């Protein structure tokens, strides 16, 4: 009787505030991020095995297989996230006795796409074990656990917003404090506002960013080394996230676009590689085609861009982007957080 | 006090049965179609004007402007659908007195994409007038009206499935009879089945089909001219749509894929240009990459293809398709039918 479980968690568009969730900034001044989940998913699958082994498979089809032993798996640099989730679950919920299983992942967008894929993948792996082991972990616990596994257990530097979008789902405004304290504010946005927003957003995939780690390091350095102007850009990122949140609650699209423009300027000034000449060319083309505001979705340097465009200019913008390197798509938001289902047993 | 209304209606994936909804077949034997709406939309906007004129704007940015006169607009071959919707509403709900307004449309996929864009656009224009005039038209009435406007008023040959997906939303199994009698069967599919299905579907945009009219004409000719083998292919299309419907209700994915394979064979045999060498090359590549079944979504000859692929082979299939001409995407279903909202007054 093999058991087969799948879980999924939606990826996310960073709307405002990204950068203020980097460790030194959040811990010192408090960070704010406004984000929203979209119709693209990370997935994890658990299949119990009929042989004494553990198998890990990743999105880019890396594979590791081990013999069933009663010591933690070493985090040797290959598939550390899968191993660390596995180690945590075995130690904390199965009294340290290994379980014969294959843990596999796949994702609707590769890492560096600006959709929060890395942390979303950690979240979905945890969710799959929550279903397999029937664990009483609520959304806060899963998001806090995903954070621990990635940033502490696997020692990976990064932000704090992606764990929460992946778990809770929908539009959320997050407040980040010291000692890993995060408050999630679910935003119940009016239906008309959501329809108007999707009607006015165009996404543009520019390719994989290879700048995220560098951007996060530079943003962290801003605070640690007291780079005054760059810190002030970050305070601007924080301020505009709150402005945007209130604009969405009031259905004030004029304020929404003005806060995105100021936010994008602030984000570019916070780190040298957030934008580059190639990204600025697209941005400028989008503006003269009729977009009113835009930004890179994730840390920066590539991945998805999003543009706000009035409906009368929408098709013009879509045609213009067709002439650049990348893929255009509409933007559809999802309300559901991470979900699991069973296929066998 | 200008009034601004927007409406949207979701586009659709043809899952099974397409072709049996062509006029001679449906009227003679009864047609069946299984389809489901996706996360891509057609839109219409109505703005009342402060000058005595009527303006029409289309998705590909064609524009017509007329003086406010008290006779129906001529269907001269430019923007006939917009004009005919306008004429109908003025004659039937405004006692024949013209209304000064701009009616504009735009769409997340161009015609020939295989997503039912043409009829979906007619539906959304009607919905916008339903909101502007506060009309008591339910979903059946809007779908029957969209059919009348396109196929009778504008004399355009085509199918019957798209008007119903655009209006009702979700997964529907439609039964088509003579005298324009259609029964919509909403399918309440289990959540796990829907998640499993989205996890197993990959979409692939091959470019605009220019075969739809020819395919529909050939399918119609099959019946009118008694082409025995080609009629029998169509009976197979019909049969497999019912099989697929029952497979989705039972969560039987083995039967689902077998009915899609038989359906695709039957569809190709119903009309010479449903597939071609270019489409078959993609299909074959998808199969050897691990897809278990696939098809062209609309009438055929191009547009979106969909593939069912087991989750363990999903990323392999995605990588393989990356090497062909077209765009890959995930498949996310929507439950909502056509919706309208107000921006001013
Ligand atoms: N200095 C660093 N060294 C090594 N890895 C890092 C460093 N900083 C961040 N990372 C990690 O690199 C991984 C890839 O992240 P990234 O390229 O941002 O793709 P993503 O997960 O799609 N998020 P984003 O694209 O920014 O929305 C994440 O797990 C980060 O935690
Ligand atoms: N013989 C014909 N002559 C002129 N127009 C036709 C004929 N047959 C069909 N049409 C119309 O051509 C238009 C374009 O349809 P089509 O290329 O199928 O794009 P679509 O609306 O995206 N549907 P599909 O792509 O098949 O899902 C529709 O309004 C049809 O009604
Ligand atoms: Cl972000
Ligand atoms: Cl952001
Ligand atoms: Cl179809
Ligand atoms: Cl079909
Ligand atoms: Mg990403
Ligand atoms: Mg189409």
XYZ file of C-alpha atoms and ligand atoms in Angstrom, chain A residues 14-18 34 161 267 295-298, ligand 4:
13
model
C 6.154 41.439 -5.217
C 4.024 44.597 -5.336
C 5.917 46.875 -2.956
C 8.379 46.878 -0.087
C 10.805 44.160 -1.279
C 2.863 44.098 -0.024
C 8.125 37.657 2.274
C 14.304 50.146 -5.305
C 8.835 47.340 -11.686
C 10.849 44.132 -11.488
C 8.857 41.691 -9.325
C 11.571 40.068 -7.190
Cl 8.606 44.777 -4.029
